[model samples]
Target: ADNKFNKEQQNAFYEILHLPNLNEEQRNAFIXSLKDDPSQSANLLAEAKKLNDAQAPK
Candidate 1:
């Protein structure tokens, strides 16, 4: 409704971005890039992390 995620969705975002494996670069390009529809953002970022992790090889 707020053109953004609700509480549950926000939690989802935190869960993913906060994941050490995903929150790399220590750049924390999170919150700021979380422009809108945070729920979607959370899911997309989670998927991105999975793909990136698969190739970390370390």
Candidate 2:
């Protein structure tokens, strides 16, 4: 995927999955956030935008 979070994003999520920042709901929310973003697509998209902008006419 061009735009996803990549495994590195949540590499520690699994390990810290139980550390008490909040209740079970909080943990679940954090896990969901990681899963929602599967890769660095936002970064990729920004790069593409720059390239396209350069090629665009004035």
Candidate 3:
């Protein structure tokens, strides 16, 4: 049940889905961004983590 996206892309999609507290819009947007450039999947994940960290109460 898949086509085009590779393992990294699929992993990135799953990781993004699992990021804490992201609403549907944010989640979908991040996935869309990754789909736009799967080669940047790692970098995008880092950026998403940065967003997560910045938004954290700590």
Q: What is the C-alpha RMSD of each candidate to the true structure, in Å?
A: 4.9, 14.4, 2.6
- In the range 1-58, model 2's lDDT, one tens digit per residue, is 3243455554435433534433455445555654666364344334334444554555
- Per-residue lDDT, model 2, residue 47, is 38
TM-score ranking, high to low: 3, 1, 2
Sorting all predicted structures by lDDT, with the top scorer first, yields 3, 1, 2
> Each candidate's lDDT (Cα)?
0.56, 0.45, 0.74
Model 2 residue runs over 4 Å out of place are 1-7, 39-58
Stretches off by above 4 angstroms in model 1 are 1-5, 23-33, 55-57
Which candidate's TM-score is highest?
3
**Could you tell me which residue pairs clash in candidate 2?**
3-41, 4-39, 4-40, 4-41, 5-38, 5-39, 6-39
Instruction: Kindly list the per-residue Cα lDDT of model 3 for residues 10-45, writing each as its tens digit.
Output: 777777777885656776778888877778888777
Best of the two (1, 2) by lDDT? 1
- Per-residue CA lDDT of model 1 for 15-55, tens digit only, reads 55556655464214554455444546665566656755764
Q: The CA-based lDDT of model 2 is what? A: 0.45
